Write a protein that binds this ligand. Structure first.
Ligand SMILES: CCCCCCCCCCCCCCCCCC(=O)OC[C@H](COP(=O)(O)OCCN)OC(=O)CCCCCCCCCCCCCCCCC
Ligand code: HEC
Ligand code: HEM
Ligand code: HEM
Ligand SMILES: COc1c(O)c(C)c(C/C=C(\C)CC/C=C(\C)CC/C=C(/C)CC/C=C(\C)CC/C=C(\C)CCC=C(C)C)c(O)c1OC
Lengths: 48, 55, 238, 76, 373, 66
């Protein structure tokens, strides 16, 4: 979308800003997601 | 341009995620390990210390 | 020339298959009641269990179960304290010689890294503990020996320690010799690598991150390299 | 450095901007044919040494086993 | 700016050939591996203790209680293995494409190879397992070959009658200090090369087609770094003990000796050669030559074409050389008994005859086929 | 208490391939015993039988066990 480029990518700093924010949130999702996936993968064999 | 710049931002975030983690792990390594982490234990005996003596 | 233990479908074998952590619990019970009389898990301390198959307070219980005397005393040359969480597992036969003395001069190797130290350990362990078969014709083991087709030389000083129903699992799972050998092989495995589970989670996150990042970095490389890969050269002598 | 590397003459060189060209044009379209083209031109030079390494490795293993095999006449 | 002058020129605008394949990534990977090893080595050095009293335990503590300490230790071990994989492929690229005609770069390279092998040997001695102690004794005694100078020299390194704490501590010091000398020698390696520029797989003068390095061979090196990191981690996090040895997880017993002793994979080709020669001294020498034959390589080039892209007979001889290098790697593993020995003896004879005799004769024949000779 | 292993070893031996092997070994056993002045032992013979039996057990033991 042009909006993205026009607003988020056009300014190099914003390009970084978006990356920064994204990084701040990516961890949360990826961690939790992978954790659960892992949890499901080894659904029964764990400490619980 | 957007699509291309999109790819890079994405790649950037990826490297960042892993970067933060590995570094954290290493810094975590230097951090006191469990070996010394466990030190809560303490043993005391009141009779040994008479009034006016520090131990 | 040695029998090569077969591949068993160990649960933890799976790329992302973590250690049961339920079985281990059973396995340790096996080490505590049978294997701890001769072997020493020197590098595994009660605290280590917390988080794997025993909870903090729960571990505290086990720690206290045994007694540990430390020499430093104000006037005494020792003081006996029930084991604390930090205390490491109690090794019998303090000096190896003690062990040799009673073990026919055969040192029970610490089973802390036995699985890691023995080629195909998990299998070997299971096989050895369950390989106590009949000696063949012509064999003449020396005094105080037994016959196991796997052990190097097939002459292990260790007598067969797992007789069916040797110990009772607190969980109640039938204590058949095998169920006991599989549990102690899982436990010894855990011992030789307490991080097995944590790692595999790191490996799963690594595979997901590389599956995200490799085509994107390849796309960036092919962007920057497209320019040249489309360059058309023409020779135009005047 | 650049500018003093070499002397060429009358060699025109056209090119396009990255964002003006698709990322993997005809990638699998011609990539496969090319990769296959490539493998043909090099397989006869590369593969038969590793084939006879595989035969020597197997042979060694089996021969070694037979070597370890007990002579029937042994101790009889 | 003085520094930026050095930087941009060396790392950004270095006129590089446009057609170099992925094999040219490998040397940069080696540099990254060096840094990785150094970094992981530094984080092993904050908890390791050279005392033979606490070595085994120090390491155990490293893989048991040190936070993520198992991760850093197995990254260090598998990064040494990845270093030798990238080193062997770098040397194979140099042999195949005729890059040994850069003679000073090649000689600084073979010095770097000797230093890396010594560093990895003493590093493998460092955890003080069963396998480390018997391995150290064994090729240290190898040094005992020299008749007048050898014996004393051995105990000199052993710092005593037999390897014992005296060795461990000095091996820790030397294993610590040599990768920085390797980094300085790598800087000299890069200098002796920029004077001449890199080679291309066609072996021709690439001065007509050179491109910058920043946007073309940097993102390529980044992609190669990412792929090498994928292979290392998947060789640490999933198959962590694949390349190691199980008997190194036992403590060092001088009274017992591991029944089946073998060098790590990378040092085997040499091991085979050593075992092959009946004479002890002969073995040591041949062993050395095994590595040194490479240095000797730029004086054996008798062809009018630099690379092997247009040379099929020498391509066949090169792949036969790679084949019996793999054979020598396998033999080293095999124990001493028929027929592993004969293969070892032949494989060594074929290795030295292909490098010394067969390739220059083949290059002469190839020059004769093109009506050049 | 029937150890699954016990049962598995039964089925596995029942495998014909394995059956043939055992026979060979027994021949060796008696041959060895019958031979008076000798040192050859059936260990190697024993070894071979086991490999097979074990492999078979490997295929069916883990699951049987709980
Ligand atoms: C594995 C086989 C890889 C392979 O594809 O080999 C054939 C390849 C053909 O390349 P070429 O003839 O130059 O044609 C290029 C056309 N674009 O030719 C090449 O790939 C050349 C590869 C050079 C590096 C090969 C390294 C192999 C391992 C050598 C290890 C031992 C090195 C010496 C150690 C002492
Ligand atoms: C009451 C005595 C005793 C019990 C119970 C016992 N062991 Fe042992 N074990 C020994 C002795 C003695 C040795 C030394 C034998 C030798 O070195 O030849 C030994 C040696 C070993 C070895 C070394 C084999 C090798 O490869 O060198 C392993 C593995 C082993 N035991 C496993 C176990 C396991 C697994 C259990 C239970 C799940 C167990 N032991 C229970 C006495 C015992
Ligand atoms: C200056 C940087 C380095 C430092 C500080 C360092 C430090 C250490 C330490 C303390 C150990 C003992 C850990 C252990 O083995 O349990 C070790 C082991 C080792 N190091 Fe290094 N090292 C460095 C560079 C290297 C390099 C460049 C290589 C490769 C050539 C290397 C290869 C090894 C190997 C193979 C081991 C043994 C791994 C094993 O236990 O099996 N190290 N290093
Ligand atoms: C770990 C040690 C080494 C490192 C870090 C290293 C690093 C490098 C680097 C960064 C380059 C630049 C070109 C490239 O990477 O493709 C290079 C070039 C080269 N290296 Fe190495 N090298 C090492 C060992 C060796 C050895 C042992 C040899 C000899 C067998 C060697 C032979 C060469 C040659 C011939 C070139 C020029 C190839 C070309 O650019 O066309 N190097 N090295
Ligand atoms: C264009 O030509 C060059 C080139 O100019 C340079 C500098 C390098 C060097 C690149 C690297 C990043 C390798 C790093 C080399 C070292 C000096 C290793 C030393 C390590 C440290 C601890 C620092 C090349 O590899 C290369 O060819 C591709």
């Amino acid at each position: 979308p042009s909006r993205l480029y026009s607003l988020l990518f056009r300014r190099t700093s914003t390009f970084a800003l978006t990356i920064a924010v994204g990084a701040l949130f990516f961890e949360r999702a990826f961690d939790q997601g992978a954790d659960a996936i892992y949890e499901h993968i080894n659904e029964g064999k764990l400490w619980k | 341009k957007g699509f291309s710049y999109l790819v890079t931002a994405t790649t950037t975030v990826g490297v960042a995620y892993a970067a933060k983690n590995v570094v954290s792990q290493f810094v975590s390594s230097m951090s006191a390990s469990a070996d010394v982490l466990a030190m809560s234990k303490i043993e005391i005996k009141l009779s040994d210390i008479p009034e006016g003596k520090n131990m | 020339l040695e029998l090569h233990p077969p591949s068993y479908p160990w649960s933890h074998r799976g790329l992302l298959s973590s250690l049961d952590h339920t079985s281990i619990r059973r396995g340790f019970q096996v080490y505590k009641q049978v294997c701890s009389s001769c072997h020493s898990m020197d590098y595994v301390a009660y605290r280590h269990l917390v988080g794997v198959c025993y909870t903090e307070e729960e571990a505290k219980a086990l720690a206290e179960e045994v007694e540990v005397q430390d020499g430093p005393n104000d006037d005494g040359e020792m003081f006996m304290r029930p084991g604390k969480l930090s205390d490491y597992f109690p090794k019998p036969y303090p000096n190896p010689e003690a062990a040799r003395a009673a073990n026919n001069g055969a040192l029970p190797p610490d089973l802390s890294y036995i699985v890691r130290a023995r080629h195909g350990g998990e299998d070997y362990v299971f096989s050895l503990l369950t390989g106590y078969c009949e000696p063949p014709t012509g064999v003449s083991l020396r005094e105080g020996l037994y016959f196991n087709p796997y052990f190097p030389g097939q002459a292990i000083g260790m007598a067969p320690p797992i007789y069916t129903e040797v110990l009772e699992y607190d969980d109640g799972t039938p204590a058949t010799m095998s169920q006991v050998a599989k549990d102690v092989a899982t436990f010894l495995r855990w011992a030789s690598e307490p991080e097995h589970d944590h790692r595999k989670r790191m490996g799963l996150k690594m595979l997901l991150m590389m599956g995200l990042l490799l085509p994107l970095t390849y796309a960036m490389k092919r962007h920057k390299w497209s320019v040249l890969k489309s360059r058309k050269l023409a020779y135009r002598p005047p | 450095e650049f500018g003093n590397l070499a002397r060429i003459r009358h060699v025109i060189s056209y090119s396009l901007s990255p964002f003006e060209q698709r990322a993997f044009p005809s990638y699998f379209s011609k990539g496969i044919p090319n990769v296959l083209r490539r493998t043909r031109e090099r397989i006869l030079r590369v593969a038969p040494p590793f084939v006879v390494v595989y035969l020597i490795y197997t042979w060694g293993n089996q021969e070694f086993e037979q070597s370890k095999r007990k002579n029937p006449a042994m101790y009889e | 700016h003085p520094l930026f002058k050095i930087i941009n020129h060396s790392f950004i605008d270095l006129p590089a050939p446009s057609n170099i394949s992925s094999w040219w990534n490998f040397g940069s990977l080696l540099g990254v591996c060096l840094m990785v090893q150094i970094i992981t080595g530094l984080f092993l050095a904050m908890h390791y203790t050279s005392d033979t009293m606490t070595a085994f335990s120090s390491v155990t503590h490293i893989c048991r209680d040190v936070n993520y300490g198992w991760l850093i230790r197995y990254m260090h071990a598998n990064g040494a293995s990845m270093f030798f994989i990238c080193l062997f492929l770098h040397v194979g690229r140099g042999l195949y494409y005729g890059s040994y005609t850069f003679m000073e770069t090649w000689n600084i390279g073979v010095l770097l190879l000797f230093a890396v092998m010594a560093t990895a040997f003493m590093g493998y001695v460092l955890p003080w397992g069963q396998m480390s102690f018997w391995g150290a004794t064994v090729i240290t005694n190898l040094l005992s070959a020299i008749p007048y100078i050898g014996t004393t020299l051995v105990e000199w390194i052993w710092g005593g009658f037999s390897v014992d704490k005296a060795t461990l501590t000095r091996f820790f010091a030397f294993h610590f200090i040599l990768p920085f000398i390797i980094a300085a020698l790598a800087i000299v390696h890069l200098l002796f090369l920029h004077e001449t520029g890199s080679n291309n797989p066609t072996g021709l003068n690439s001065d007509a087609d050179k491109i910058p390095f920043h946007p073309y061979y940097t993102i390529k090196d980044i992609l190669g770094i990412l792929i090498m990191f994928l292979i290392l981690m998947t060789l640490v996090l999933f198959f962590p003990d694949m390349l190691g040895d199980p008997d190194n997880y036992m403590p060092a017993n001088p009274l017992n000796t591991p029944p089946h002793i073998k060098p790590e994979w990378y040092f085997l080709f040499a091991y085979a050669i050593l075992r092959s020669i009946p004479n002890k001294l002969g073995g040591v020498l041949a062993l050395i030559l095994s590595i040194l034959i490479l240095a000797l390589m730029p004086f054996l080039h008798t062809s009018k074409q630099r690379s092997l892209m247009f040379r099929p007979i020498t391509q066949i001889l090169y792949w036969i050389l790679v084949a019996n290098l793999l054979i020598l790697t396998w033999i080293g593993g095999q124990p001493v008994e028929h027929p592993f020995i004969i293969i070892g003896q032949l494989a060594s004879i074929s290795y030295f005859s292909i490098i010394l005799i067969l390739m220059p004769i083949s290059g002469i024949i190839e020059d004769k086929m093109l009506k050049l000779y | 208490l029937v150890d699954p292993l016990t049962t598995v070893r039964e089925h596995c031996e029942q495998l014909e391939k394995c059956v043939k092997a055992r026979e060979r070994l027994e021949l060796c056993d008696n041959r060895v015993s019958s031979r008076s002045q000798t040192e050859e032992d059936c260990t190697e013979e024993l070894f071979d039988f086991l490999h097979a039996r074990d492999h078979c057990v490997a295929h069916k033991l883990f699951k049987n066990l709980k």
